[PDB]
Amino acid sequence: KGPVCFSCGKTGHIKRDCKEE
Numbered sequence: 150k151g152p153v154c155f156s157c158g159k160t161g162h163i164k165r166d167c168k169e170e
């Protein structure tokens with residue numbers, strides 16, 4: 150279990166981490 154991406158819905162990064170820039 151790791152950071153969930155609330156943008157794509159994947160794992161290994163958070164939404165905020167996803168396309169932060």
Ligand SMILES: [Zn+2]
Pocket residue numbers: 154155156157158159162167168
């Ligand atoms: Zn993502």
